[PDB]
């Protein structure tokens, strides 16, 4: 349905999937880390003058079973693939996450996906150069946006940009 | 509805019930055959669990 956009947060443990979701949902941020099992949210928003609902599934970066992960990925319409700019290993992990999304969505030509480099407020701790992350997004044919769940930088942008991709795909079918 | 309990024991009991439903949904969905109705029910159960866990705190 064009009235409901199903977004999945994907990425390694501790990158800020939940922090981005909760900043977008409720305008809150806390530094306390609680690893996620699986959480979900729904919000009414206005996208380009149109009243829509966004559903967000916030996945575990430390997930136990591949079958559980695959069930979540299969149900999504678009994906925020998140890494922390302060953790190179979280950036390299995004390749395998994307592979898993592609495999579960086997017969879809192009999957709505945005690459999100979170924790932009910790520039002094950056381990992932902007050029490296952007070049990877270009190789995947997707956009790269840097966010901070703490300062709100680009948080609304990533959710709304992905919704626009989901909309464009939905209007092509 | 499911968010109506006000005791820690009652909220925990509703969490245990929703997690049971969630596990049963995953068992059904792990066959890999598309089922948008069951996927929608799974997201709803997760929304309820998320709401319950916030009430629990
Ligand atoms: N400075 C800063 N800290 C952030 C940012 N986003 C998240 N954090 C912090 O990083 C930690 C991990 O955040 P969290 O959202 O729980 O990560 P997650 O990806 O959901 N982890 P998991 O997969 O285990 O659920 C928390 O301590 C959180 O406050 C950000 O943009 N800036
Ligand atoms: Mg989380």
Author numbering:
A (entry chain A): 11 to 183
B (entry chain D): 388 to 444
Lines from the paper:
Ral GTPases have been implicated as critical drivers of cell growth and metastasis in numerous Ras-driven cancers. Upon association with and activation by Ras·GTP, RalGDS activates the Ral (Ras-like) small GTPases, RalA, and RalB. The Ral GTPases share a panel of effectors including RLIP76 (also called RalBP1), members of the exocyst complex (Sec5 and Exo84), and the transcription factor ZONAB. Our solution structure of the RBD of RLIP76 in complex with RalB revealed that the interaction is mediated by a well-structured coiled-coil domain in which more than 80% of the interactions with Ral are mediated by the C-terminal α2 helix.
The tightest binding sequences, termed HLR (E427H/Q433L/K440R) and SMLR (E427S/L429M/Q433L/K440R), displayed affinities of 5 and 3 nM for RalA, respectively, a vast improvement on the wild-type RBD affinity of around 100 nM. We obtained high-quality crystals for both the RalB/RLIP76 RBD HLR and SMLR mutant complexes, which diffracted to 1.5 Å resolution. ITC revealed that the Q433L mutation was the key driver for improved affinity, resulting in a ∼20 to 30-fold improvement in affinity compared with the wild-type RBD. Crystal structures of the HLR and SMLR mutant RBDs in complex with RalB revealed that this leucine side chain is able to sustain a network of hydrophobic interactions involving Ral and RBD residues. The mutant RBD structures show that the side chain of Leu433 contributes to a hydrophobic network of interactions involving several Ral residues (Ala48, Leu67, Tyr82) and Trp430 of RLIP76. In the wild-type RBD complex, Gln433 points out to the solvent, leaving a space at the edge of the hydrophobic pocket where Trp430 is buried in an interaction known to be essential for the binding affinity. When the Gln is replaced by Leu, the side chain shifts toward the pocket and fills this space. Lys440 forms a hydrogen bond with RalB Asp49 in the wild-type complex and this interaction has been shown to be critical for binding to Ral, as alanine replacement reduced the affinity tenfold. Replacement with arginine in the HLR and SMLR mutants allows this hydrogen bond to be maintained while an additional hydrogen bond with the backbone carbonyl of RalB Ala48 is gained. The replacement of Glu427 with histidine or serine breaks a salt bridge formed with RalB without forming any new interactions and ITC data demonstrated that this substitution did not improve binding to Ral proteins.
